[PDB]
């Protein structure tokens, strides 16, 4: 880990140039030293505030919501210094981290970051308050290129299927949990009780990890299967039978 720190009270110009130093080192380590780099830029909202300060110092007029008009090009210049390049066995992955003001997903920072980036991972306040960690809300979260990172030879044969099925059962469980308080518990069918149990154990055994517990992708998949076995095979309708028959038992 090469760690760059721009403290809250260090010069905002040093904040402007920190992401670029980070990414320049990442390009050296990736496209010249040929080693897969993961760039974790933290508080790009605190970066955009420094961008605002530098613009106002230049005495440009503000753009939308007070941010410069060119913030799209600038954030793109930061993010798009990523990805694999032909003929060099390295790469650069990025994980920007955004403090969304007012929790408004329309705010310029998250809006533009969604335009340039390829997904979103939501840290969620209801989960955090319930004291789940990592409070990653997997319903609105998305990874538009997950379909390349999985499958045989990359993670395992059943990764995509288990992901889809866990998402489906989690969403149906949230639906059933919303319905429970309206119809009452004894008005629920046995399948809905299975889904409620799955919701509980997905938020308690799979999402919830604890800070210092490291789970390989294989272990995450096996936990996923331990949850999917709450259901008899016929309910796992998004998993192909060729996979159900191989992984489900035990």
């Amino acid at each position: 880990v090469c760690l760059f720190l721009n403290l809250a009270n260090d010069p905002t110009i040093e904040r402007i140039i920190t992401p670029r130093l980070a990414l320049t080192t990442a390009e050296f380590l990736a496209y010249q030293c040929e080693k897969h780099v993961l760039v974790i830029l933290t508080d790009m909202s605190s970066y955009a505030e420094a961008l605002r300060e530098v613009s106002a110092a230049r005495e440009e007029v503000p753009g939308r919501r007070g941010f410069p008009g060119y913030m799209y090009t600038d954030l793109a210049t930061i993010y798009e210094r990523a990805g694999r390049v032909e003929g060099r066995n390295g790469s650069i992955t990025q994980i920007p981290i955004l403090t969304m003001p007012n929790d408004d997903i329309t705010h310029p920072i998250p809006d533009l970051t969604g335009y340039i980036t390829e997904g979103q991972i939501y840290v969620d306040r209801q989960l955090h308050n319930r004291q789940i960690y990592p409070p990653i809300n997997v319903l609105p979260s998305l990874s538009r290129l997950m379909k390349s990172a999985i499958g045989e030879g990359m993670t395992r044969k059943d990764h995509a299927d288990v992901s889809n099925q866990l998402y489906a059962c989690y969403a149906i469980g949230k639906d059933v949990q919303a319905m429970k308080a309206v119809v009452g518990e004894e008005a629920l069918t046995s399948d809905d009780l299975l889904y409620l149990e799955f919701l509980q154990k997905f938020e308690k055994n799979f999402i919830t990890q604890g800070p210092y517990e490291n789970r390989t992708v294989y272990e995450t998949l096996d936990i996923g299967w331990q949850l999917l076995r709450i259901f008899p095979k016929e309910m796992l309708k998004r998993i192909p039978q060729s996979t159900l028959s191989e992984f489900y038992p035990r």
């Binding site: 007029v61 503000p62 007012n102 319905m179 309206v182 119809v183 008005a187």
Partner: protein
């Protein structure tokens, strides 16, 4: 009227988004309550049909048991109709529950005063006893059916009210908030545009000041 009449602001936009999502949560929960009431109501209608079908046969058998009793006992009908006194059977209403809605139902119960004891003593005997039994069976079936009918009617009222609530939300309350949100966004764009114009003007005046000084 079109708009909620909150004054444009970022605070107002936040409040309106919160309220829109609140009304949408209300819509979803009430729609699920309506679906529970509708599934129960449909089930109850189907069982009304089936129990009317069963009532046909049961009453037909009971009438034949009455015929058989008359065969042995003769014209005891007047005896029974005169010795009324008080009823052995009395029905108790009970508060059932589906969704958040309370369903009145009936429980069969006995006060025990069999005013017609010994009535078949001379001749009626076992045939008259079996008639008592047949019409006790009929009473049970019809009490179940009456609980069914009361649940059916009350669920009809509940469904009408809940559908009216859901339609009210999704045709009045939510569109009202959506219109207010559109208006708030437009007016905030206007505030931003005015600020932009003022700042542009100040910048131009500073440039002109530079030209005046140099």
């Amino acid at each position: 009227k079109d708009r909620i009449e909150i004054f444009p602001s970022r605070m107002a936009q936040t409040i309106m988004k919160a309220r829109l999502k609140g009304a949408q949560t209300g819509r979803n929960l009430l729609k699920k309550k309506s679906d529970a009431l509708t599934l129960r109501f449909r089930q109850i209608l189907k069982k009304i049909i089936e129990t009317k079908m069963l009532m046909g046969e049961v009453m037909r058998e009971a009438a034949f048991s009455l015929a058989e009793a008359k065969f042995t006992a003769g014209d005891f009908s007047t005896t029974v109709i005169q010795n009324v006194n008080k009823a052995q059977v009395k029905i108790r209403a009970k508060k059932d529950n589906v969704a958040g809605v309370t369903l009145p139902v009936f429980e069969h119960y006995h006060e025990g005063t069999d005013s017609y004891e010994l009535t078949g003593l001379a001749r009626g005997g076992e045939q008259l006893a079996k008639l008592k039994r047949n019409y006790a069976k009929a009473v049970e079936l019809l009490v179940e059916l009456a609980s069914l009918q009361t649940s059916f009617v009350t669920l009809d009222e509940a469904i009408k009210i809940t559908n009216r609530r859901v339609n009210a939300i999704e045709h009045v309350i939510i569109p009202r908030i959506e219109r207010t949100l559109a208006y708030i966004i437009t007016e905030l764009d206007e505030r931003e545009r005015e600020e932009f114009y003022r700042l542009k003007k100040i910048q131009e005046k500073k440039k002109i000041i530079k030209e005046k000084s140099e």
